[PDB]
Design a protein around this nucleic acid. Sequence first.
RNA 1: CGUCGUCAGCUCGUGCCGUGAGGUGUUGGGUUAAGUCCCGCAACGAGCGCAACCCCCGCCGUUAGUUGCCAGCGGUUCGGCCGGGCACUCUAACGGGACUGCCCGCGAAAGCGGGAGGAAGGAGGGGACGACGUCUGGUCAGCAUGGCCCUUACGGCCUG
Lengths: 98, 206, 127, 155, 60, 140
Amino acid sequence: KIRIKLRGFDHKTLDASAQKIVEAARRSGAQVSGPIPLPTRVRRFTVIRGPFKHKDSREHFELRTHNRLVDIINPNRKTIEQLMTLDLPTGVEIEIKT
Amino acid sequence: GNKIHPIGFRLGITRDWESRWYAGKKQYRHLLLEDQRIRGLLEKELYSAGLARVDIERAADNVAVTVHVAKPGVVIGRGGERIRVLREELAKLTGKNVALNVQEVQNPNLSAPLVAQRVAEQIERRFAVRRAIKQAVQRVMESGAKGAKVIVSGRIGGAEQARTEWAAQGRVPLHTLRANIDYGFALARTTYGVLGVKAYIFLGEV
Amino acid sequence: EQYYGTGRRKEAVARVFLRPGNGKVTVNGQDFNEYFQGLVRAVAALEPLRAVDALGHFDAYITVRGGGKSGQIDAIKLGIARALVQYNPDYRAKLKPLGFLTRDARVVERKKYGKHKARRAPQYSKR
Amino acid sequence: ARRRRAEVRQLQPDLVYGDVLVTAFINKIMRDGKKNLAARIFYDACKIIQEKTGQEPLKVFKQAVENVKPRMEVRSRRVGGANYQVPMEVSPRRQQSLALRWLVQAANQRPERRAAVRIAHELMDAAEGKGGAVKKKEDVERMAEANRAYAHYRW
Amino acid sequence: ARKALIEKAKRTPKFKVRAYTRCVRCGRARSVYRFFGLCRICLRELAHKGQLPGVRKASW
Amino acid sequence: RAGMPYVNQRWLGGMLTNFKTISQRVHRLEELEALFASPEIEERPKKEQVRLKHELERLQKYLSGFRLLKRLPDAIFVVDPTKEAIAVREARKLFIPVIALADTDSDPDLVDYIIPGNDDAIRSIQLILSRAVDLIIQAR
RNA sequence: CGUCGUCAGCUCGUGCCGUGAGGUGUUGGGUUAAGUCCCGCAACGAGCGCAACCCCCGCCGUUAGUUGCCAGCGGUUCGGCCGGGCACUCUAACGGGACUGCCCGCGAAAGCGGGAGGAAGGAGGGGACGACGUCUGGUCAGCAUGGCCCUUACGGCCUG
Ligand SMILES: [Zn+2]
């Protein structure tokens, strides 16, 4: 009945962090839902390469955010207290829901 | 011509972002702006030290600045006075209690920014450009470095007309992704204008 | 009892289940003659059935999603072919030559910068 | 093309009649990508033909197809900055292509208000041996073997 | 990008619809982006440097 | 049927005068054939492996037998000193003795030790070479 | 940054030929999208380029099942709405698969024409990727910048 929402730019570190979250939570007794991949959100920026003119240059950039979900069921006192303690990587952002 | 930036080409693979933090649309711009301020301050301050790279990280209203320097002795000094006052200055810039770290680069001949900086210094010291480039390329190649290349922009030795000098040695495959090419640019401000020194170092594969 | 095939065509996806019976086909809780009304090519979707002289035994339950009508038609065709191959594995010996087991892979080309639409270039005159 | 020889696209046979040439004609009628509308026009015309002409519409349609099949085209050759109309023998591929085309323009050139009626009338007339399409084909034919003098420029 | 103009757009211009946005790096007023606060040129430059986290060259 | 090297595909221009440049090719061949028999080839996707296989095939085809030369040879054996004129000239330039199975259409002067006989007629080649190889084997 | 131009070119090391500048390679035949390969040949290799390494789409596996999904069953206000499952579609990670690899003929070989098999067959479709250089090419009005000039106006506010 607790939801773990993970966001980040780099998917390697996000996947890694989700792995530790789910593993540690599993070791503390009750059932784990499992890492749920949610659809990524992509922003596109199209900018003229040239600084003055040549409007047909058009370099493309993308900024993509990834999403995860963990959804721990039957929260133990140990499960919760051991959680909200593990330090996040440099990128990964976490949200706790009921 | 018009080659693209060899780093921006390989950001996903074989290179890593200098800045590693996440922020929503709400606070992205503010964090980036303060990041730019930090980078500018550290560029201005730690020039003589032999700076190569600045890394920024964020966890929770926390900043972990990491500075790559050829000579950390210059950075720290006696009893870590300079590093302490520098931490104080950075924290005064942004109320987030930044945690400054200093790393020494192994064999500073294998850092493209450093090579470009040194050659730019030599140009500003009115050295002969061609000899300087040749010596720099040879120096890099002696320290492993399966390939090296150095370019100087133009306006050589106060001559009226500008011209590119250019010198390479070994393999510099700019087209292959798994190349691990280190890139460094330095601007040399001289009495007769400005010169642009570029350095590519092909350091292994994959 | 049930034989299942997927099939895909140009952003359209189908799911087809084949069952024994009198051969009544239904699509998205409707009739194949109701969902595809007035579309001439619609019958083509059922071609892989009558190839094996089916359409008299197999009732089809189809749930289809995405793309435009023709997209669902081709998706249904490929799905039916796959389901039939599952039902009678030797059908592959005869369904393959008539071009039923191939998944047509031609999709929309992305628009390119400096061009109107992906191939067409802006007109210029007085060269 | 300077290397390849542009493999002819193999059309899909029609569903109603089980014919490829029918599909070619349907495609030739089609404009602005509306296939369903074009097929409706063709089938409407076919039923009108069946109404006004006893036998099968497919037979009449095919008959018209060969009745508007030329065998002698004129090709422009640039010799000494002058255009030479060399007679040539149109390949069966080109024969069918030109037949279907000319049939379509001839049909659409008619004064009848509705498209299906125009298609039916053109097909019927071309089957008979008269109309715009057959006239155009005859004109093209007679254009050749009239500049036979100009046929030594092989091109 | 006169220093005066840059220093002027940083206040409350007596009205809401008088204020506008400028590139925080070069003071350009033309083609800035809300998400970044940079003009197109600075955006390209910083994106190439690798100083924008999770911003990469797109190819779909 | 000896420790002796051989060249029977094509005499590359500079096998002897440009010996080091060919030793580079020998090193490349040995390192390639070591890599192919290595548990490191799980990388380099299939097309790269195909390219490497093609390269190794070519190297094995051309420099087979030449691999046994750790250094310059102390002699040479030529079947036809006119067909293999380049080899003979290279051997002359470096002060290497020349042995040839010369025939009517050859210049005897360029050959130090000469066997005036046939260069066609497989039987003639067989007899001469078999005798020479047997003498090599026995006198070891 | 544009452009020739994603055109296929630009060179170097050693060897060899020439008194020498220089040549060879890099020419010739075939083939290719390509200086891409094969053969011939005093050349044998290499570097920057082509290609490949990267991304998207096309087929299939696993790992995962919420906010996405509903084949079977039980509810059902007819709504996947409920309980259920997560099989299927899908979402997003990691791999597999295609390499003329396998048969038939042909060629000295590169390769060519057919044939299974396969989702895809000979570059599978698209993108990113732009050599030495050319254009006194474009931009002192993105930014930086040497020189010259104004500094009660060529600076800076305000209304129209
Ligand atoms: Zn800017």
